[PDB]
Ligand binder design. Structure first.
Ligand SMILES: C/C(=C\CC/C(C)=C/CSP(=O)(O)OP(=O)(O)O)CC/C=C(\C)CCCN(C)C
Length: 678
């Protein structure tokens, strides 16, 4: 909580409060199509788009992404801008430098092995070349590398279902500028509600040139105004931006700083949610599975009511697809489907099918070394997918997922792929990463203090002689700290860790028979020599914890502590650790939620947790089924009771993670607790 830290938090809040239709970089290709429009008197309709072009040429004469050089991106943006400038006979200094760049680099188009192909390049690029030849621009139309691209365009055009494109909304509307022989009377019926052709400024500019439709013009006027002459390759991106910012702040481990602002963002997303899902932009007649899956997951996680029926439209013969009627299955979309499918409730068959499909799809891509995505160049997509394949959501503890994501997140260096390369500065942001590194390291420093205190407690109480090994001590501390990690929740974190250790000692030391258990239970109330000693350890520890909470927060929970341990002991002697830990955590909270221990919803959750937290595949699957019921109950909870339901889910996930991964935790424990980020 340095001043600098607080100011950084305030800067992220200012971002969140001020989101509108998307902070997205300008596409020179799209700006050039806007700049081509004739106002009606043989002058540009948008002189500020022509100015943008001339002002934003790169020093080598190209246009495009300055920080990620791609021949495809540079050559299509540069050709478009030269066509725009030459068409009006304006800015010849820039126009000629662009022609020089094109002449010198066109032969290099295919030089980069792993270069990602801009969307629609193979139709859009030859189309621009034919415009350029029409206005007599002297570039090498006969460059040898250009034989195979032109062949591809005619092939693509014969495959497009052009009659369907005129009847129902499809993704083809985003790219009309490379097509010929269109029927505008039909296509105008498919205009989006903001005047665009599927949120593409270039496609909309071409439509306007062919139809002079006023609603196309208003979409363009609005975009050119917002971006001071330029336009992006897709706009708006309001839903994409709202959803991805929430996802990134959550995964980076810093979302608790932004609770109010995140609620407002998700209220916005929910306002535009529909029974058919969503795309990147509100109020669309085309939806996509990546936006739909991300919004579904975040809305369900935050307690909004959403139906898994939204996914039905994307399913075909047991497989799932990014868009209806297209074969694309992007790694990132299927990753986001896999994440969403894990929030399925027991009755949601379509998500069970989606979970199987997307898990197996990603497993195969990983095996074949095809974890590469058409929509984005990321720092570490294989790392993200690898973690998701290895650690299901039911086993994913907050600090474990965050510790790995902070090393995967690309910050400002990720680049998205549209018709041209683009950036999303409020999704992919180095300041978020710096805040996340600082916060992670600050919490980790506190955990290291506590780990020293905990080892001193273990040694002073001689717990090694009551059957608790050093390796177990570290596991108990880790599961608690990786779950309840905040510096201000030390009391909850430490009561869970110490309680779990004492249950192990008591069980190891007195759990063998009914006599041994009675012996211990009697000594607890009475406080056989041995049982009295371990009993005093337990009692001393409860007293210290309640005293510390009283001195720090004024809350007296002593009687509550003893009641809960008493209840656990009764059942143990006869024959429920999950429920004991949940009560302990709730007791140490800086408020009073213990009034809920009697509530029907508490009792229901307690019944389920005691079935998860058992005293192997079959056992894991049994736990998952019970987990599924807990999730549905917890996620459907009243706001005041939310903290309690969250606690049940916390404890259960720690148990599930241990059951699944507990044979080989060493690298996770080291990264989470003992290796600083950065
Ligand atoms: C309508 C769009 C693409 C064109 C249609 C498609 C899909 C063609 C791939 S089919 P193909 O395999 O044949 O390859 P090409 O022919 O198109 O080059 C998407 C525009 C939106 C964005 C850029 C925002 C994405 C935000 N999302 C990441 C969250």
């Amino acid at each position: 909580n340095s001043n600098a830290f607080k100011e950084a938090v305030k800067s992220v809040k200012t971002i969140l409060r001020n989101l509108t239709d998307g902070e997205i970089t300008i596409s020179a290709y799209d700006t050039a199509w806007v700049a081509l429009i004739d106002a009606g008197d043989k002058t540009p309709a948008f002189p500020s788009a022509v100015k943008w072009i001339a002002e934003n040429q790169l020093s080598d004469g190209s246009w495009g992404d300055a920080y990620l050089f791609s021949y495809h991106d540079r050559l299509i943006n540069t050709l478009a801008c030269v066509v725009a400038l030459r068409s009006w006979n304006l800015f010849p200094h820039q126009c000629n430098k662009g022609i020089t760049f094109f002449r010198e680099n066109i032969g290099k188009l295919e030089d980069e092995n792993d270069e990602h192909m801009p969307i629609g390049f193979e139709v859009a690029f030859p189309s621009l070349l034919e415009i350029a030849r029409g206005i007599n621009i002297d570039v090498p139309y006969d460059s040898p590398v250009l034989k195979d691209i032109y062949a591809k365009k005619e092939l693509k055009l014969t495959r497009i279902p052009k009659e369907i494109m005129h009847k129902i909304p499809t993704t083809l509307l985003h790219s009309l500028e490379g097509m010929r022989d269109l029927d505008w009377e039909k296509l105008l019926k498919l205009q989006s509600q903001d005047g665009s052709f599927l949120f593409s400024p270039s496609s909309t500019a071409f439509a306007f040139m062919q139809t002079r439709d006023s609603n196309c013009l208003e979409y363009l006027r609005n975009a050119v105004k917002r971006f001071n002459g330029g336009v992006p390759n897709v706009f708006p991106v309001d839903l994409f931006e709202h959803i991805w910012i929430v996802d990134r702040l959550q995964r980076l481990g810093i979302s608790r700083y932004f609770e109010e602002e995140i609620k407002e963002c998700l209220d916005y997303v929910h306002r535009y949610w529909t029974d058919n899902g969503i795309c990147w932009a509100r109020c669309s007649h085309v939806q996509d599975i990546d936006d739909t899956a991300m919004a579904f997951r975040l809305l369900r996680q935050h307690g909004y009511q959403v139906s898994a029926d939204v996914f039905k439209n994307f399913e075909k013969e047991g497989e799932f697809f990014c868009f209806v009627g297209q074969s694309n299955q992007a790694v990132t979309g299927m990753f986001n489907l896999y994440r969403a499918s894990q929030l399925a409730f027991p009755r949601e068959e379509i998500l069970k099918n989606a979970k199987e499909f997307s898990y197996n799809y990603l497993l195969e891509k990983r095996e074949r070394e095809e974890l590469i995505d058409k929509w984005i160049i990321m720092k570490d997509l294989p790392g993200e997918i690898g973690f998701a394949l290895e650690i299901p959501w039911y086993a994913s503890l907050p600090r474990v997922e965050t510790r790995f994501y902070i090393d995967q997140y690309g910050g400002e260096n990720d680049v998205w792929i549209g018709k041209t390369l683009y950036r999303m500065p409020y999704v992919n942001n180095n300041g978020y990463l710096e805040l996340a590194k600082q916060d992670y390291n600050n919490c980790q420093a506190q955990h290291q203090l506590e780990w020293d205190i905990f080892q001193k407690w273990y040694e002073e109480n001689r717990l090694s002689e009551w059957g608790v090994r050093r390796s177990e001590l570290l596991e108990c501390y880790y599961l608690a700290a990786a779950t309840i990690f905040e510096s201000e929740r030390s009391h909850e974190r430490m009561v869970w860790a110490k309680s779990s250790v004492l249950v192990k000692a008591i069980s190891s030391s007195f759990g063998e028979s009914s006599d041994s258990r009675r012996s211990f239970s009697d000594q607890f109330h009475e406080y056989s020599v041995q049982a009295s000693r371990l009993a005093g350890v337990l009692i001393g520890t409860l007293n210290q914890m309640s005293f510390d909470l009283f001195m720090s927060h004024g809350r007296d929970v002593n009687n509550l502590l003893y009641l809960s341990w008493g209840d656990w002991m009764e059942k143990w002697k006869l024959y429920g650790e999950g429920e004991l830990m949940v009560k302990m955590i709730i007791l140490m909270k800086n408020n009073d939620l213990t009034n809920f221990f009697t509530h029907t919803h508490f009792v229901r959750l307690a019944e389920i947790i005691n079935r998860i937290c058992l005293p192997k595949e079959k056992t894991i699957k049994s736990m998952e089924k019970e987990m599924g019921k807990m999730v549905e109950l917890a996620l459907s909870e009243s706001d005041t009771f939310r903290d309690v339901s969250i606690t049940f889910l916390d404890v259960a996930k720690a148990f599930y993670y241990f059951a699944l991964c507990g044979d080989h935790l060493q690298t996770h424990i080291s990264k989470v607790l003992f290796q600083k980020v950065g």
